[PDB]
């Protein structure tokens, strides 16, 4: 099998910034990887296209995936509103880790974050399911619009997304 590769084209107040592509570890977390892949192609009728990164904290991570409320309180999986913590085999070892945001054990929906640093304190609590394959420089450019409190100075959106491989 081959792990899926997904992309996001990021825009900053509608201006295109660039493409970030992600390898999803379907061989290790199939259900979590499948959820993010299907939400990136929009094939169930809902997904990430047009949604924003609502909380970016420089040196920590960029968070997005709330396509229903756009503020951290909504979004849902392709399995129903929430699904279980599949496993915690993988850790938040450094910049580029793609991991699920949540509100406690077994509350995975659509929200995710992209780590810009090693965040070992989230190991065992947030399921790591992918990594940035190309476009880490686009993630870095994105951090310049966040703040310590997480609010962005510009609206950072996923102008388009889908699967490459």
């Amino acid at each position: 099998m081959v792990n899926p590769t997904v992309f996001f084209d990021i825009a900053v107040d509608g201006e295109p910034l660039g493409r970030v592509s992600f390898e999803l570890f379907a061989d290790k977390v199939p259900k979590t990887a499948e959820n993010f892949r299907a939400l990136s192609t929009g094939e169930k009728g809902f997904g990430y296209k047009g949604s924003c990164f609502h909380r970016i904290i420089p040196g920590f991570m960029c968070q997005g995936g709330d396509f229903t409320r756009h503020n951290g309180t909504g979004g849902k999986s392709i399995y129903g509103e929430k699904f279980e913590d599949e496993n915690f085999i993988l850790k938040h070892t450094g910049p580029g880790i793609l991991s699920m945001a949540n509100a406690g054990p077994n509350t995975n929906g659509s929200q995710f974050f992209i780590c810009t640093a090693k965040t070992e304190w989230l190991d065992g609590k947030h399921v790591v399911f992918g990594k940035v394959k190309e476009g880490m420089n686009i993630v870095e450019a994105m951090e310049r619009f966040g703040s310590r409190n997480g609010k962005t100075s510009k609206k950072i959106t996923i102008a388009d997304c889908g699967q490459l491989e």
Binding site: R55, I57, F60, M61, Q63, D66, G72, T73, G75, S99, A101, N102, A103, T107, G109, Q111, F113, T119, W121, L122, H126, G150
Partner: peptide, 11 residues
Amino acid sequence: XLLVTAGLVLA
């Protein structure tokens, strides 16, 4: 603190 939650963002 530095968490990534959905709904109540904690310190």
